[PDB]
């Protein structure tokens, strides 16, 4: 009797889902593994309790809307969603997904990867991203901890709470001052708050992830965005005025152009034992100027990935996504209503 508890808090997913086991937490959800008694298989279930904060509601609605509409081998699916039968009773949302074994953050924390693993993982990240971007969506928060792996080295991108249609404009305010667990994978233009950034921000993130697979260390850590820029410039060298084309804040632009000159550090000096083709691709992803970054299609065609490259089996969305309304200018009560309606179809009865 009673609903199961995990590390101290209720997990009300029975009777369909039973035998809960803790997996971990992010900044926003707690994730457990569970036995699905309908499909007779173990699954993952992320609990979120977002309805007291506008931004939590935002993350929840975005991830639900986008993932329910994506279908790709290298992107996590949503199998089911549990929440109370009435909007008033609804305080928590349970997102059920395919169960994965680990993520790239934990793996890299202690485990060495061969050049072949690195190559295969990078390929899968990019195959996933090709689909995301083809749907005219930006992930915006790619990092090792939301690259899931199973035991057969299958990789799946998750954690779409910050994903947005690449509405080539749109002003997403608050995004930069909002809490996240790590900012180490963010492109320099987004850290500097340049409205009008593009798909290239994701490519930058992937570049940071590749660097980390090569060395088991983050390439641009830092206590904050200014310190992070100091790491970035220390390796890529000083930017030109043309590089700062996408840096729109006046003082930030002048600050950057005022700094002491920095020479580029060759990639093979930092990564002395890496495949030289990996370093060439890395060099093309981690370019300061967003418009000169290699895009995802050309990246998949890079000589480093030629052994897995196959455009006959790298599927895209049949049509670009177009978000229903605008979620950033909605009260949390409305966002809750939209979440209720978006999850209605999984209710026992519907």
């Amino acid at each position: 009797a009673g609903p199961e508890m995990v590390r101290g808090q209720v997990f009300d997913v029975g009777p369909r889902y039973t035998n809960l086991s803790y997996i971990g937490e992010g900044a926003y959800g707690m994730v457990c593994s569970a036995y699905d008694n309908v499909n007779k298989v173990r699954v993952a279930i992320k609990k979120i309790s977002p309805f007291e904060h506008q931004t939590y509601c935002q993350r929840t609605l975005r991830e639900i809307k986008i993932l329910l509409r994506f279908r790709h081998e290298n992107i996590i699916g949503i199998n089911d969603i549990i929440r109370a039968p009435t909007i008033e009773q609804m305080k928590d949302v349970y997102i059920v997904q395919d169960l994965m074994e680990t993520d790239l953050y934990k793996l890299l924390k202690t485990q060495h990867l061969s050049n072949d693993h690195i190559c295969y993982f990078l390929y899968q990240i990019l195959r996933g991203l090709k689909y995301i971007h083809s749907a005219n969506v930006l992930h915006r928060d790619l990092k090792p901890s939301n690259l899931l792996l199973n035991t057969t080295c299958d990789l799946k991108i998750c954690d779409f709470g910050l994903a947005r249609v690449a509405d080539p404009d749109h002003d997403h305010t608050g995004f930069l001052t909002e809490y996240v667990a790590t900012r180490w994978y963010r492109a320099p233009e987004i850290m500097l708050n340049s409205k009008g950034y593009t798909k290239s921000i994701d490519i930058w993130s992937v570049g940071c992830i590749l660097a980390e697979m090569l060395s088991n260390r983050p390439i641009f850590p830092g206590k904050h965005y200014l310190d992070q820029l100091n790491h970035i410039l220390g390796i890529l060298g000083s930017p030109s005025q043309e590089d700062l084309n996408c840096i729109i804040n006046l003082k930030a632009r002048n600050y950057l152009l005022s700094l002491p000159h920095k020479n580029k550090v060759p990639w093979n000096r930092l990564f002395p034992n890496a495949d030289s083709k990996a370093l060439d691709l890395l060099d093309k992803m981690l370019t300061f100027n967003p418009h000169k970054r290699i895009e995802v299609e050309q990246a998949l065609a890079h000589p480093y990935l030629e052994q897995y490259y196959d455009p006959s089996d790298e599927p895209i969305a049949e049509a670009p996504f177009k978000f229903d309304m605008e979620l950033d200018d909605l009260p949390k009560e409305k966002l809750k209503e939209l979440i209720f309606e978006e999850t209605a179809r999984f209710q026992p009865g519907y």
Binding site: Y120, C153, D154
Partner: peptide
């Protein structure tokens, strides 16, 4: 983390 040989995608590319 086996040889990627057991991964289905890598297996599809092994053709």
């Amino acid at each position: 983390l086996s040889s990627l040989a057991a991964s289905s995608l890598a297996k599809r590319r092994q053709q």
